[PDB]
Amino acid sequence: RRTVEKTWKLMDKVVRLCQNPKLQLKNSPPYILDILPDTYQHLRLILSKYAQLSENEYFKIYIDSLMKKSKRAIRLFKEGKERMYQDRRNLTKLSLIFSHMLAEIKAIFPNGQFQGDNFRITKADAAEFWRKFFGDKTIVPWKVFRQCLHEVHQISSGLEAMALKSTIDLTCNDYISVFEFDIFTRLFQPWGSILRNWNFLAVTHPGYMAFLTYDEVKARLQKYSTKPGSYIFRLSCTRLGQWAIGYVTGDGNILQTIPHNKPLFQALIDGSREGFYLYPDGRSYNP
Secondary structure, eight states: OHHHHHHHHHHHHHHHHHTOGGGOOOOOSSOHHHHHHHHHHHHHHHHHHOOTTTTOHHHHHHHHHHHHHHHHHHHHHHHHGGGGOOHHHHHHHHHHHHHHHHHHHHHHSSTTSOOGGGOOOSSHHHHHHHHHHTTTOSOOBHHHHHHHHHHHSOOOOHHHHHHHHHHHOSSOSSBOOHHHHHHHHHHTOOSTTHHHHHIIIIITOTTEEEEOOHHHHHHHGGGGTTSTTEEEEEEOGGGTTOEEEEEEOTTSOEEEEOOSSSOHHHHHHHHTTTTOSOEETTOSOOO
16 A cells, blocks of 8 residues: 555646646546546555455556556646647547556456456457466566467567557556457457458558547548548447447438447448448548
8 A cells, every 4th residue: 555655646646737727628538537536446445355465466567557657647747838738639648548547457356356367358269368378367568468469360570569569558558468458359359360350450441540539530520421421430438349330321410330249340341331331531442
């Protein structure tokens, strides 16, 4: 708790810094003004229930992530000055990453207790991969993983690795827990063509907006009312491991679907067929 008294303390400076009126935070997911507070409430849940907690390696890496994370914001509010109303956009990249650190600690410690030992990963192939390789593990550094990842699904170049590090390392801490893992496995399934989809999808596809809000997505496709068929897809902070599809109707309107649990790969392949998905990001060509 010694360092976490130092962890919360840092987090309060930050919620202290954000609450500034000159910031006009339009708290639309994520709400840096809630995720952070909620993150504390849970640490109380977690610390309530628990030296066994002390040796938890993920807890250590995690709180390390949180604080390392906390001070950067402040430092940010420092460097930035007036700019505070690229240093800003950075702020958002963060409230985002905190949003995820939220979800993960929530997932590894449900109701307040450690259950990483038993995370049930959604896709099976996916699960045997990790079990086989990591088995008992809950968190794994980046290099290690990539290496194993590599024994099965070869990674074309140092460039692409990091780019993938980028897509799997949410919390941004150079480690990959079963969670950051379990989400990405569900995002880019099926397990066999793992890296194949990812590349075709979130790397060269004009239709991959990464994280976005339902208001922004609409916002963007308001520039295509004129052309129904135009669509784009995204991830969601409020529901990680999930893609939602936005597109414009022959009614001129803008609709939003979320596949239940059919991959994006097919969805788009099909929706494009009923002539639903035809001009990725209002762009002529569509793969």
